[PDB]
Amino acid sequence: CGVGFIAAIDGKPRRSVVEKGIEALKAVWHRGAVDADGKTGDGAGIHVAVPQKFFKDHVKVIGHRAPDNKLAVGQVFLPRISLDAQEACRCIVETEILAFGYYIYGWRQVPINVDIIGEKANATRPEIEQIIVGNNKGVSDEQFELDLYIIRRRIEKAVKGEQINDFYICSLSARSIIYKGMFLAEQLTTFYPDLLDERFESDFAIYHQRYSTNTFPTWPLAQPFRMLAHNGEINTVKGNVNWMKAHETRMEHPAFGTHMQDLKPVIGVGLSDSGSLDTVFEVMVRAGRTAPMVKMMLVPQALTSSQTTPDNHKALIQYCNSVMEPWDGPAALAMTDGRWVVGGMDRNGLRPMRYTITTDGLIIGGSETGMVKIDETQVIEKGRLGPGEMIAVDLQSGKLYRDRELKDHLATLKPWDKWVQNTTHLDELVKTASLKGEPSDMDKAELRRRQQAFGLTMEDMELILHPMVEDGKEAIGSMGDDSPIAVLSDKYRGLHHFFRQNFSQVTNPPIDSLRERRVMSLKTRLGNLGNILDEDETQTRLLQLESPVLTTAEFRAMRDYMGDTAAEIDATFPVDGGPEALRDALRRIRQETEDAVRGGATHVILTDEAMGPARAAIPAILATGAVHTHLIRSNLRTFTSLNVRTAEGLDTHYFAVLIGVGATTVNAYLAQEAIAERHRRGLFGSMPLEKGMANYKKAIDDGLLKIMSKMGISVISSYRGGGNFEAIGLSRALVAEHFPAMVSRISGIGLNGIQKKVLEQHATAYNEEVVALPVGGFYRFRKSGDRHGWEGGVIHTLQQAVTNDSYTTFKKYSEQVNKRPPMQLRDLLELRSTKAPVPVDEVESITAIRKRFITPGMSMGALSPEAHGTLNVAMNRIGAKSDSGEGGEDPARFRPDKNGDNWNSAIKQVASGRFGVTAEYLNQCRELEIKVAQGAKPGEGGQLPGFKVTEMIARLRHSTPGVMLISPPPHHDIYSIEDLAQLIYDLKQINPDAKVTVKLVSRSGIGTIAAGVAKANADIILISGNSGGTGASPQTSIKFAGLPWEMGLSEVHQVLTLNRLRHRVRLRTDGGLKTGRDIVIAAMLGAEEFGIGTASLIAMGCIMVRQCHSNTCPVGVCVQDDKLRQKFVGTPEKVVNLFTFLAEEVREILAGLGFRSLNEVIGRTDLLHQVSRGAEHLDDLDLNPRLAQVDPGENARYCTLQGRNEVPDTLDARIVADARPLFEEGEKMQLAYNARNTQRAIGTRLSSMVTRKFGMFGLQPGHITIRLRGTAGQSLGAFAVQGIKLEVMGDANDYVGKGLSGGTIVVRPTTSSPLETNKNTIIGNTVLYGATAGKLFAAGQAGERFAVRNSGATVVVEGCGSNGCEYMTGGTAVILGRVGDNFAAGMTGGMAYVYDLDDSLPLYINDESVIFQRIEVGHYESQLKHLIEEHVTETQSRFAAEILNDWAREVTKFWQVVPKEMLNRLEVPVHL
Amino acid sequence: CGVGFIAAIDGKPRRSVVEKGIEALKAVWHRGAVDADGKTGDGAGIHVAVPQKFFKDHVKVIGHRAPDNKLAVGQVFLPRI
């Protein structure tokens, strides 16, 4: 993957531009996806200006005359198969180009060579042709461009009207032209020989090569698009299309006029995210705005809440945020209007983008540095890009523009500072509220009756209601959930329980919510939805609210402010309406609102206060959905707004799922009354109502921010109405009609069961005389509660069976488990074979099947070391595979003791934290593991309480004892698919023995990501469920995240079979596997290996107390204090007996079924038959969308390849062939090489050889050194061991020093470069990720997210950007330059030595956990002096030498940053 | 190539109708498209009445209750990819 742009400053055409463009494109073959056929690609495109002279000469050759004005060429893909459609397309384009007055010059068939493209990509190759037209009316150029664009759009619409598919238009303009296709990005100039002539010379050029997930290519889906390029993916595209449909009707401009009517459906059909972004961008720029203004309005800079920018830019950003909803997502944009060329980043700056200026007036930019070969002495500036920045080139006068100058020129054009104060905030109205109007809070009996009307039990009002008002945050869970799904339940479940939240796997990186809170917002705007193309003051007159949720007092204040334009609507329906009262009520409301909005009302306030004994409350979610979707389909939602009052929402999930429907605000007036009645009963103590309400509001805000960051969105303005949810158990019609766009994999109950349950609950609440709330069990088991999974009798029977070692007791346990009513999905099927029963003495052995099951990872931090080692040895004793999980592991357990038992694990994990990841830790296993997203709590990192980190676990995780460890949810290394491929290559390079696996959690559309990772050479995919365990997590995350692994696994199997990819990767499932029946079912669905998990822990003595998060497990398993540890009763024989019994049961059921071996059943979906629950439930769950399958063909239904998938080798291989004496006699060496950018992960296989021969610290420093010249590739020196010195002359690409383990890497420019060192970038983003030991010396500026998660390493650089030293844990960093904004976010260990002249540090620091001061102790003075001395004597920077020279007056300019919780542990008191 | 039809004069169903229909289809192979491939053709099919009892057996097996009145069956071709 890659995107880049070249341009000339002045603007004179020259062949060198396209020459360097094609050359740089020819070197993007290392980031691609090379396959076995080697010919098929996944899309590549180039984009230049029109070569007028060539077409003029050609048309002179034909026989016409070349006019004085410029020409315009239109390039099109026409159907190739049938000769009946090409005539139609020619007819259409000619009819619609001759209807305006222009003169056709003729057609032309571009010469091509189809010999290099593969076969599968050739089966859908369309016919490429071009037409030539010319301005003859003497009209200006801008009118020419506008008219051609309108003609092109009209042709597209007219041809779409005839259903004549397989037709596309590349680009129709007189300034730009596009050559794109599905070939390989290297052989472009061979497919298009036109680019080989000496006349195609342009002022600018764009090149792009994408990385597609699936394998089926479609030509019209190749980048660049019309007037835009892109990299990555946009998270918030679902709500963007809906808001665009809303804005379509309230826009017009005289530039279009009558033909404006021809452009109503702005966003077409059947495109990716970049396609919609491109169409909107084009239709906006054709109105008069330039490129930078449109970029600032579409993807606005992250609005920082500080004074780091002049206020004019702040007013401009406020206006742009008000006028158009942002577009989040990782993106590196290179947009090219016919006048400007702007390269910019997104809000967060998640992807790299580096540019170089030559001394010839030539600017180049892209994702890498050494793609195009540049001379070393002709470089003027090597620059990078941070968040929200943008660099611009103006060809109209030949002028460059960096960030500040460009934005200042932009904000010069209009008086932005005077339009912002026209609006007002809410606090002004709150502060003037007269102290009056106290509503008499309803009686306790009334409140209890209304609460029973929605089944809100009492455990809710004290488990997740008391902490939210008392502490100021949400509750904490301790284990997976075993309550059935919302449809299979029996009690009245709220409608929100049928909605599962979404997240993002490797396709989209989630963003943390505890560090980068400055880049997120919850602003709501009332009275802003309107025109988008015009400019006036009628768009800055509105009201702004800071939070989408409101209390009662503020809501009444707003209602009093809105005056005589607010229309109320009753959301209650008469219970005696009849069998179909709900449909009548919904029709009535969805008609009444459309009536009221046209009468003169601009606000709709949906209320439900009219609930009475004869009228029940319509579910607010469904009513809001219907009303919003009707206002959207009726072209009215823009005209009004929507404020909702509820009576059933209490937790953070309800407000989120209700906002995700389309409502603007949400008010809950029951929770406040319950809080008041609980406060006046003197329960919180002496906390007044105001402070409690404030803490409650803050907790709700935190919850909304967490749930909004769980997906990758930054601003609520794009999430409202986005419909980022999954529905299970709802009918296809109801969801597909009342809700905008939510995929329901299985149809479910309609409007009969819902109304039935609602009326039954209303009757059991109001019609009877109730006085006390029921106890209820949803978070902890009770006798009057629903059916949980782990029942007391079940646990006791299993424990007696595993202790007595009795097969009959285990059989009785399995029977007891199977004889329950339906609880999960696997309770709705039934095995059904057709063959004759085979005697049990003919199926395979017990050990041969035992060698499949494994036990998942368990963090050393959550568990006690005793149970850890016990499970480890119990799995390693028989020969099966075990796990280790995160949290590292003790090194002393690498070799067996005298007794003959190995405490080492067989599988190591690579989580987002990378705590115990050193060189030695990654070479003592036979299988690696990537923890992309955890099962029980996806979209979140591993959590651990503050007092659970003892001395041992801290010395193991390389952390300061006594801190609440929160691993970052983002991965900081997998931002897209190609980065995942790079990490896979790194892991396969460091360990030439084992394999690497990836973990996932089930959701809709996971098959695409599966087929994507299947092209990344990965060979084992572990698909988790949503019923697994954890150490600690919020209950909202446990109960409301993921889907049962049935749909996910059954869809991954289908997808991986559909692209001939099943035969290359294994498949392993886990999550909720208890007995043999479920194991056989999972194997039937298409799995090979399995897991046990919590079940095994029950054999270990776990009693499901669900108090593991307090380090007080009574049986002594999840404990880190020495007192409870001595209560352990674990014994590996228990696990051996458990596995033996499970294998015996599976053998017996398979023998009875009719087969002989498991490897002859995988994929046989036809052996199951769905059985109905009957007519007692009237639900319509049809599981057929899972039982489906595609015939495999010739390959096997399972993996049929032994050994790992080989990957190509880089230069380091040839290095090993030269370093014989170091591995035969051990003598020093000193090598030199000319390294290039297409060599990834240099210096890792040598590191593996060293650590297998000698170890980590077995050598002296600087034993072997390598001098590389020229720029280096990605992931330089990843996992270097102490003794190796990599000296590179030039600059590193990305991820340098990832996981440094004692080595030494130095980067310095070529000594013959006339560049000032401290004024140029020399490293990419994400430097020294996961570093634990070593020294790094730079000679330039650093990228972004610098030295994150450092543990014990030292680093010296000459500058940094945003999020520097984020979540650092230990080591030493010295930055000599300008630090970025939000520095040292969450730093709880180590130090920072900053050098800043203009006193800008107190403005950028994140003064939360760290303190900054002057240097006061002579010891640290000498330490810093010696560090700078080592730097200057190692890399010889002029700036460091000058600093070293004048030392008397420079230390008083240095500042020191030190964490707070480390003041009382430093042996040297930093104070006096 | 060709089209044929078999009907019952009285109007009482029987297996012999479908049997003879398949028998007829098994004898128009020569007038079709023969090529060196040996597998592909140019399309064929048959059209019969709804065997109510078979779908009744299916819907009884699935767990529902067989309705007395007549069922209606629908055959749909969805995009596979």
Ligand SMILES: Cc1cc2nc3c(=O)[nH]c(=O)nc-3n(C[C@H](O)[C@H](O)[C@H](O)COP(=O)(O)O)c2cc1C
């Ligand atoms: C006590 C416990 C700790 C766990 N710790 C982790 C962990 O640190 N990282 C991780 O990815 N999964 C962790 N898991 C989840 C397991 O990988 C796996 O999903 C779980 O064993 C399946 O649960 P089940 O037995 O209910 O099917 C943990 C599970 C449990 C029960």
Ligand code: F3S
């Ligand atoms: S909840 Fe955890 S602490 Fe022990 S008793 Fe059960 S495994």
